[PDB]
Amino acid sequence: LAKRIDAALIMKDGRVVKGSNFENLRDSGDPVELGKFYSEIGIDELSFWDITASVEKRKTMLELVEKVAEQIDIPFTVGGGIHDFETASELILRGADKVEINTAAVENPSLITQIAQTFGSQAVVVYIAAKRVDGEFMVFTYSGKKNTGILLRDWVVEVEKRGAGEIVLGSIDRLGTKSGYDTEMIRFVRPLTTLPIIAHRGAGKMEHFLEAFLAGADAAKADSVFHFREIDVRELKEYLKKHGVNVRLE
């Protein structure tokens, strides 16, 4: 099974929030330059997540997408408060390959179908933030602030039915930790969907990526562990290939 390594970049006002430790870059906080560098060292796909204030947010995200599409030749997603079809459409047309949606999809699951009808399922990534509550995996919205009362098991099935292309499974039980991806959650979700599962939250060392792939993840996404250079991307790819994981190098 081919496996993918993804890097996520959190952005505000056109800048990478908290930057990165790559001293070789002209501007280690420029999301375009940082994303281009990642694409040259072994990242397979990029995610750009925007948290800009509402008044400049739409134009900021559109300008980001346009610049990234010109400079980078790997697929990328954009996300962060994409609430309706028109917003998703303008970002895809401006250059993004995929949009990543969460709270708006939970509140209006037909948004998944509406985007997929024009852009295909492959353009729709649903990010599912989940946490254990009273012994059950529950779906959370609004950056983890709201327990929806929807079971993870039910939402995964609905997301596929509505036409999503990929699911990013983010474990709130691992946010800020470096103890590993939530492999129990990945194993819980794996039999429920045919879609690619992207693990998110908890990665602290290269072996954690191996564990996530053994759990059934098709891709593993991380952020600060790469930006602060706790894990080197090329070392990670060499490690995974050494231990039998079908990852891409050259």
Numbering used by the authors: 2 to 251
What does the paper say about this structure?
Computational design of KE07 involved construction of a theozyme to catalyze the chemical reaction, which was then grafted into the scaffold of imidazole glycerol phosphate synthase (HisF) from Thermotoga maritima. Catalytically essential residues from the initial design include a base (Glu101) that facilitates C−H bond cleavage, an H-bond donor (Lys222) to stabilize the phenoxide intermediate, and a π-stacking residue (Trp50), which was designed to stabilize the transition state and favor substrate binding through interactions with the aromatic ring of the substrate. This initial KE07 design (Round 1; R1) catalyzes the cleavage of 5-nitrobenzisoxazole, with 103-fold rate acceleration over the noncatalyzed reaction and a turnover rate (kcat) of 0.018 s−1.
Thus, the mechanism by which the remote mutations that appear in R5 and R6 increase activity is qualitatively different. This is mirrored in their location within the protein; in contrast to the initial mutations that affect the active site directly, the mutations in R5 (Val12Met) and R6 (Lys146Thr) are remote from the active site. The Val12Met and Phe77Ile mutations, also in the second shell, cause changes to internal cavities that cause a slight rotation in the backbone at Trp50 that also favors the alternative configuration. To the solution sampling of these states, we used HREX-MD simulations, which are among the most comprehensive computational methods to investigate conformational sampling. These results were consistent with the crystallography and kinetic analysis: whereas in R1 (original design), configuration A was the dominant substate that was sampled, by R5 we observe increased sampling of configurations B and C. By R7 and R7-2, configuration C (which was the only state we saw associated with product in the crystal structures) becomes the dominant substate sampled, with configurations A and B sampled only rarely. These simulations also reveal that the mobility of Glu101 was reduced as a result of the hydrogen bond formed to the indole nitrogen of Trp50 in R5; this could account for the improved pre-exponential factor from R5 onwards.
